[PDB]
Design a binder for these strands. Structure first.
Ligand SMILES: [Mg+2]
Ligand SMILES: [Mg+2]
Ligand SMILES: [Mg+2]
Ligand SMILES: [Mg+2]
Ligand SMILES: [Mg+2]
Ligand SMILES: [Mg+2]
Ligand SMILES: [Mg+2]
Ligand SMILES: [Mg+2]
Ligand SMILES: [Mg+2]
Ligand SMILES: [Mg+2]
Ligand SMILES: [Mg+2]
Ligand SMILES: [Mg+2]
Ligand SMILES: [Mg+2]
Ligand SMILES: [Mg+2]
Ligand SMILES: [Mg+2]
Ligand SMILES: [Mg+2]
Ligand SMILES: [Mg+2]
Ligand SMILES: [Mg+2]
Lengths: 156, 205, 164, 50, 273
RNA sequence: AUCAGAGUGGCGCAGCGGAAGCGUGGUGGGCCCAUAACCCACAGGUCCCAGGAUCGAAACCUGGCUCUGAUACCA
RNA sequence: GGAUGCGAUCAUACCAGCACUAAGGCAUCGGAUCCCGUCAGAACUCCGAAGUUAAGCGUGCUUGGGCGAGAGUAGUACAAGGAUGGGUGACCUCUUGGGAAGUCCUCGUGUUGCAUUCCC
RNA sequence: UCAACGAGAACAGAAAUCUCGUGUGGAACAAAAGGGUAAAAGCUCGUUUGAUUCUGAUUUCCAGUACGAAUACGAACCGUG
RNA sequence: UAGCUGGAGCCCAUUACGAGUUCUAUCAGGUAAAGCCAAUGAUUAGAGGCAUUGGGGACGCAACGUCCUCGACCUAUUCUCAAACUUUAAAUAGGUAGGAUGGCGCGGCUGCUUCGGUGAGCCGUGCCAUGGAAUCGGGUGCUCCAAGUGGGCCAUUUUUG
């Protein structure tokens, strides 16, 4: 309304990708959701029911209520000077589970394992990542060194 | 009659071509782009010289017509009708609009004419001749460049005729017989396709 | 190959009379086929309402039936007994088939037993080799390879060497 | 005198000068709107805890 | 023949369609479980008839692919007693009974769900009476036209008579009175215990002795007249309910010989002519 | 400059999708010594140029044109 | 080395043209009484094994088309931030970062699950 | 399985009806444009009335008001298979 | 009326927790660029064969034939292109996660769920969990009452007439 209906400006947002038109692979239906997982809303052109508004294509949020044929997602929309946790129900064809927390949930166990292994021995460790910092010195075994000089200008 | 070209010299608007939306346009000045002997093959006119535009602008259809005929009259009178092939390498697809008591209420204008958008280092015309006869074209392009608004060079191109192959490489490939001569163009041969469709003496790895 | 699965055999005859008309005239063109087959033609309504031929759209103009088996062979040999067993070497279509047309009564069957006029008709047969169910069945349908597709030399060298 | 005016100029400043207020994340997140078939069960069990 | 732009814009369909074997519109609807059940798969009762077998499976959908828990064929009926005529309506009945009995025996609830000990045509559903609900399956015909009398619905009757729960109705069992809108107990009984072949064996034997011999060779040479079909099926069903339990294709020639053969064709073509 | 109107038989005009006429003119006869007038018959058209939909256009609508008519004010 | 049923990934799996296949299985196939289907037992349905690997299925081949991968195209096109940067302007350079795409060239042509079954 | 195209068939031709082949959709889906679809969302047939009842939720507009429209559940009653 | 603002407070706070920021992981994009030697649309010129006859000459005594002819057509090319064209596809900008609001054991509830302790969730209890990238730092954290404003203008860059 007010100049723009539900599916405006989506000449390309809602299209299928090239040579991925037609059928829905069964995996998008047999991936199962539980309340709390982080899922990515990406609308699917061909399934017209339960569709989310074009704003929500390409966001992530936590499932908050799961029903038959429908997932309840709870994502942040920024309006004014505040963040509203909007709650939408999207049909399962429009959501894919996210791999944002893949590394997190792997690393959680990878950490608790080393805190256990440290409790084994001298019970001091530090299970933190550090961003790539200064690289230490080393010798370079002198090889053939290629001299490069700026090229004279051939107009052609 | 027609407005000064200074009004339509700069690109300020996104391209506005003829379509199911820009209709009522008149047909452009230019309707012929290849003049002279366009029937001669690759091996006849090797030397090629281009008039290259050096500033982003809108060369009008009238300008890009008058330029070719000014490049043709010289070439014809001096070096004869059988020694040059001229090709105007740009097409008037941009449609200029004109807006003409009532002011700028409803200010969108009806189409006026048609002009071709050029860019830095865009070949604008080409002549092909025989190196013995190249000087005439060298001067004919210079005599035509005073019909365009910007700066242009008159650059001989390193390639052979209107083909994508340099003089050295094309002569190498002629002696190796690895090139199909098509007319004004030529085609390399190679290692793809079916062995069958090749002529008995035209098979390469 | 001389593999006796590859035996050419008439799939079906098809009988078509299109009158461009309707009403009682076409109802009689139904009988001129009903006697021939023993099975009821299905009408073929027009399309496109092309006026210069005098037809509206969606109105029944034609009448056809498909015959297959012993009856189709029986009536096909009478169809060529009309032509004196000779076709035009072009009536054979490039894919698998050939056809012709006749005026009814130089077949057999008494003439005004309904008092119906002489309707000419379209004979058209598509030969098959055994196993086009592979291109016709609902589950796992696919083309038939070249080695078992009747072609023009196959239809011609079916027509002239045998069946006559 | 053109009474139709529109900008978003200065609106990001007004939004952000007092922060983009995120809501306090909550222990015991709200259930209103959830699946009534799920919530009736959930209530009834808590009715019959021991 | 089909041009380059055609090939380049072509989208291929799913493999199990280019082979013409699966209906995905049916499959989505059969496998798709409600997302508030989270794992509990919908077990499909998948029956398929070839020209000489009646395959049957209970299968569920997994990401990796469908996983079978009980497969029952008609070519394992000879071990039970049926040697001839193994793709008929009653053979599919027996195959359904066998698959239901084996699912029951594998999940160990057969003794509380024995089904009908004896076959009947009058439609059957089980009492879910106490604490153990019957194994619930969803029938999957596949591509067959579900017309009345279909062997698939004989297999449905057998799967129920084994005790399985499969949602159903009698509008396709053999012998449904499509005019009057109720089954006939006796005619479905006839179909299930092989009456419809028995009467045709008698019909050929009376006034068609040469087709009877060309048409039922295996019945002949196993000495089974149309007289002995029902009791035969009694014994085979009893057996079913009591005992439900190098190089010839060419290698892809590799790059070295490929590249050598190529220069050989090339030298042949170039030097010649 | 915009807003409308009409473009249909040689002429001026009818016309509501199945789709071509009104009056007048043209053609061959008849009455007449002859021409009219009158009597009997006969042929008609690129339905303004290019489209689209539409069982189905000449009409509905849209582009390309020519003539005609309107409203064009406070300074 | 195979097959069938149900498949997940959906062209490396398709398309076109060829050659070929042990056992089993698939298929082709024979019939129309039945249930069933139509104009038509061609299709669909019921019944059945007398033959054929001819098609399908499968596998492989092509200096094949397509597809997928890579190298080059190219630090090019563009582009975030900076210049009391150049030029008459269009634009262009330098400084702190990001960085594409066609043609051209080389390679490859499927992976695999559950259940049953065949090989020699 | 559509548009179309290749070959054929009495009168029948560019175009009437029939048959085979190819046919990634070049057709259709009431209307404007865009998106979507090929054992369908298209064409034909079958049975029909969920175009029903109660009151909420949510989205779109948005002041996170109403309305319009739409979606997903719930408690009934049903249609079709 | 919402926003921006003040005043009145209150609530906690160096444990926490948050950020107009970067980092690591992972989603989404169809703009610049590129493309037509890829679909749509536009569009310049040739080359080669080829039509069951688009129309002609001449031979066609003939055709189920051809040389020229304006050229359809197919094949492989070529110039130029698109805000309401796109296979491909940037940069900047967008979303989410980076633990104490986490997990595992035990034994309980359900009127939901399943063939079924099967799941789903909750409930009680016991254990763990070196604080889970960098940097920074008290907070709109919660609320009340209310002001003025709702004519804008310039600049670098993107951009419509
Ligand atoms: Mg708005
Ligand atoms: Mg309103
Ligand atoms: Mg309003
Ligand atoms: Mg997109
Ligand atoms: Mg709807
Ligand atoms: Mg204002
Ligand atoms: Mg179905
Ligand atoms: Mg007269
Ligand atoms: Mg007179
Ligand atoms: Mg500055
Ligand atoms: Mg509302
Ligand atoms: Mg206020
Ligand atoms: Mg856009
Ligand atoms: Mg661009
Ligand atoms: Mg194009
Ligand atoms: Mg590109
Ligand atoms: Mg933006
Ligand atoms: Mg991001």
């Amino acid at each position: 309304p007010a100049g723009h209906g539900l599916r405006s400006r989506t000449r390309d947002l809602f299209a299928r990708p090239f040579r991925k038109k037609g059928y829905i692979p069964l995996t998008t239906y047999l991936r199962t959701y539980k309340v709390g997982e982080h899922v990515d809303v990406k609308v699917n052109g061909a399934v017209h029911k339960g569709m989310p508004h074009k704003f929500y294509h390409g966001r992530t949020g936590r499932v908050w209520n799961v029903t038959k044929r429908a997932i309840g997602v709870e994502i942040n929309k920024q309006v004014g000077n505040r963040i509203i946790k909007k709650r939408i129900h999207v049909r399962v064809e429009h959501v894919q589970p996210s791999r944002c927390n893949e590394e997190f949930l792997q690393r959680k166990l990878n950490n608790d394992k080393l805190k256990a292994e440290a409790k084994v021995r001298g019970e001091v460790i530090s299970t933190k990542r550090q961003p790539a910092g200064p690289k230490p010195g080393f010798m370079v075994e002198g090889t053939t060194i290629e001299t490069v000089t700026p090229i004279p200008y051939d107009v052609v | 009659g027609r407005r000064p070209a200074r009004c339509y010299r700069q690109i300020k608007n996104k391209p506005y071509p003829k379509s199911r939306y820009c209709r009522g346009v008149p047909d452009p000045k230019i309707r012929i782009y290849d003049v002279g002997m366009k029937k001669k093959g690759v091996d006849e006119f090797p030397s090629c010289v281009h008039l290259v535009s050096w500033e982003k602008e809108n060369v009008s259809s009238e300008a890009l017509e008058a330029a070719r005929i000014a490049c043709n009259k010289y070439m014809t009178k001096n070096a004869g009708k059988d020694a040059f092939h001229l090709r105007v390498r740009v097409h008037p697809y941009h449609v200029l609009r004109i807006n003409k008591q009532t002011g700028m209420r409803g200010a969108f204008g009806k189409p006026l004419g048609t002009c071709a958008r050029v860019d830095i280092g865009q070949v604008l015309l080409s002549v092909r001749c025989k190196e013995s006869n190249a000087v005439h074209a060298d001067e004919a392009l210079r005599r035509a460049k005073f019909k365009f608004p910007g700066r242009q060079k008159i650059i001989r191109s390193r390639k052979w005729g209107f083909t994508k192959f340099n003089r050295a490489d094309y002569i190498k490939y002629k002696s190796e017989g690895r090139i199909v001569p098509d007319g004004v163009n030529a085609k390399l041969l190679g290692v793809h396709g079916p062995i069958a469709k090749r002529a008995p003496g035209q098979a390469i790895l | 190959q001389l593999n006796p699965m590859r035996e050419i055999k008439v799939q079906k005859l098809v009988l078509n009379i299109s009158v461009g008309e309707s009403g009682d005239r076409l109802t009689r063109a139904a009988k001129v086929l009903e006697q021939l087959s023993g099975q009821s033609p299905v009408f073929s309504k027009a399309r496109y309402t092309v006026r210069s031929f005098g037809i509206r759209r969606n109105e029944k103009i034609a009448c056809y039936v498909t015959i297959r088996g012993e009856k189709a062979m029986q009536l096909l040999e009478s169809g060529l007994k009309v032509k004196e067993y000779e076709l035009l070497r072009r009536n054979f279509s490039d894919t698998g088939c050939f056809g012709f047309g006749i005026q009814e009564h130089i077949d057999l069957g008494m003439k005004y037993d309904p008092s119906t006029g002489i309707y000419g008709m379209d004979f058209f047969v598509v030969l098959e080799r055994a196993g086009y169910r592979v291109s016709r069945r609902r589950r796992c349908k696919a083309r038939v390879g070249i080695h078992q597709r009747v072609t023009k030399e196959d239809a011609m060298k079916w027509f002239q060497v045998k069946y006559e | 005198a053109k009474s139709k005016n529109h900008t978003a100029h200065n609106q990001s400043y007004k939004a952000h000068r007092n922060g983009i207020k995120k809501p306090k994340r909550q222990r015991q997140a709200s259930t209103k709107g959830m699946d009534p078939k799920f919530l009736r069960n959930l209530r009834y069990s808590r009715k019959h805890n021991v | 023949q089909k041009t380059r732009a055609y090939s380049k814009r072509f989208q291929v369909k799913f493999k199990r369609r280019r082979q013409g074997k699966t209906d995905y519109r049916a499959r989505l609807r059969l496998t798709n479980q409600d997302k508030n059940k989270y794992n509990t798969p919908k077990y499909r009762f998948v029956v398929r008839f070839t020209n000489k077998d009646v395959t049957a499976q209970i299968v569920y959908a997994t990401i990796a692919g469908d996983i079978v828990m009980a497969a029952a064929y008609s070519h394992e009926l000879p071990r039970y007693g049926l040697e001839v005529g193994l793709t008929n309506y009653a053979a599919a009945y027996c195959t359904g009974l066998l698959l239901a009995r084996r699912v029951l025996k594998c999940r160990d609830l057969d003794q509380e769900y024995e089904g009908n000990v004896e076959a009947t045509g009058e439609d059957f559903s089980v009492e879910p009476a106490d604490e153990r609900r019957p194994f619930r399956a969803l029938l999957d015909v596949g591509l067959i036209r579900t017309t009345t009398g279909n062997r698939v619905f004989g297999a449905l009757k057998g799967a129920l008579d084994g005790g399985l729960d499969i949602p159903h109705s009698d509008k396709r069992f053999a012998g449904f009175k499509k005019d009057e809108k109720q089954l006939d107990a006796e005619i479905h009984r006839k179909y299930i215990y092989g009456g419809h072949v028995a009467d045709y064996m008698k019909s050929l034997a009376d006034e068609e002795p040469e087709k009877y011999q060309s048409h039922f060779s295996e019945y002949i040479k196993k000495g089974i007249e149309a007289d002995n079909m029902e009791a035969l099926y009694k014994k085979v069903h009893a057996a079913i309910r009591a005992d439900p339990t190098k190089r010839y294709n060419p290698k892809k020639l590799t790059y070295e010989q490929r590249k050598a053969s190529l220069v050989e064709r090339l030298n042949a073509l170039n030097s010649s002519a």
